Amino acid sequence: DDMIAAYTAALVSGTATAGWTFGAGAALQIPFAMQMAYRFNGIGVTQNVLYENQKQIANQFNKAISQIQESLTTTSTALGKLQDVVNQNAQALNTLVKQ
Amino acid sequence: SISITTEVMPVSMAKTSVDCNMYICGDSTECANLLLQYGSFCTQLNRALS
Amino acid sequence: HVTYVPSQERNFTTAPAICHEGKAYFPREGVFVFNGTSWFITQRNFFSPQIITTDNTFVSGNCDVVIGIINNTVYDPL
Ligand SMILES: *[C@@H]1O[C@H](CO)[C@@H](O)[C@H](O)[C@H]1NC(C)=O
Ligand SMILES: *[C@@H]1O[C@H](CO)[C@@H](O)[C@H](O)[C@H]1NC(C)=O
Numbered sequence: 001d002d003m004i005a006a007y008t009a010a011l012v013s014g015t016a017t018a019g020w021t022f023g024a025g026a027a028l029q030i031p032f033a034m035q036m037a038y039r040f041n042g043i044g045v046t047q048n049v050l051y052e053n054q055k056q057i058a059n060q061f062n063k064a065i066s067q068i069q070e071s072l073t074t075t076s077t078a079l080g081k082l083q084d085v086v087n088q089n090a091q092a093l094n095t096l097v098k099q
Numbered sequence: 100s101i102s103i104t105t106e107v108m109p110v111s112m113a114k115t116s117v118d119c120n121m122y123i124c125g126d127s128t129e130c131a132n133l134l135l136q137y138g139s140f141c142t143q144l145n146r147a148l149s
Numbered sequence: 150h151v152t153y154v155p156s157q158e159r160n161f162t163t164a165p166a167i168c169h170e171g172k173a174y175f176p177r178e179g180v181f182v183f184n185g186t187s188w189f190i191t192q193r194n195f196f197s198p199q200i201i202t203t204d205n206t207f208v209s210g211n212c213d214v215v216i217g218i219i220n221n222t223v224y225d226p227l
Contacts, residue, residue: 025155034165047175048209051165099139
């Protein structure tokens with residue numbers, strides 16, 4: 001699990017500091033606001049719409065992250081496709097013993 | 100030119116179920132008692148169909 | 150599959166927008182870079198510096214909102 005955690009940490013760190021470039025060729029540095037402006041051009045909105053109201057966009061991003069981490073420390077069925085898989089495997093082996 | 104083309108795709112199939120005792124033994128009592136010794140085949144089969 | 154790969158990168162310093170006379174100027178398709186002597190506009194994938202004109206730049210707002218505005222001149226073919 002530590003190797004997979006290292007992989008995902010490297011992936012998030014590359015995304016936050018390089019952008020879309022470290023999958024095509026090498027890694028090219030860019031500030032995060034200019035990267036978000038390029039992605040805004042990607043969805044069809046001009047760069048200024050990011051640039052005059054960058055602060056409320058950052059606030060909305062931070063609030064959405066904080067709302068996800070709240071909802072994870074709550075009831076089950078969020079991760080229900082994984083747990084079910086685990087259960088199925090265990091169940092099969094139990095049958096093979098009782099049989 | 101403007102052209103409209105059709106494409107057909109299957110989505111689901113029929114849901115089925117089986118009574119293990121009725122298929123194997125029918126109405127016989129002796130067969131049912133002998134079938135009790137073959138444990139955990141009919142449950143493992145109904146679970147897959149469900 | 151034949152594919153295009155970028156090869157040799159180079160560092161520049163950049164700004165989100167430039168301010169000519171009380172107006173913010175944003176690039177159309179490219180980034181503003183500082184060559185070392187002058188400020189140019191260039192496409193991201195290949196380095197081809199272009200002189201900043203009114204053609205490849207658009208205007209929006211005043212120079213008191215954007216973080217990282219700089220002072221530079223926008224050429225007009227007139
Ligand atoms: C300049 O580019 C080189 C690679 O070409 C890089 O190692 C170096 O960190 C860059 N300079 C700065 C100040 O980041
Ligand atoms: C851009 O910079 C290079 C070296 O930094 C210089 O030789 C060149 O003259 C500059 N471009 C212009 C248009 O002056």
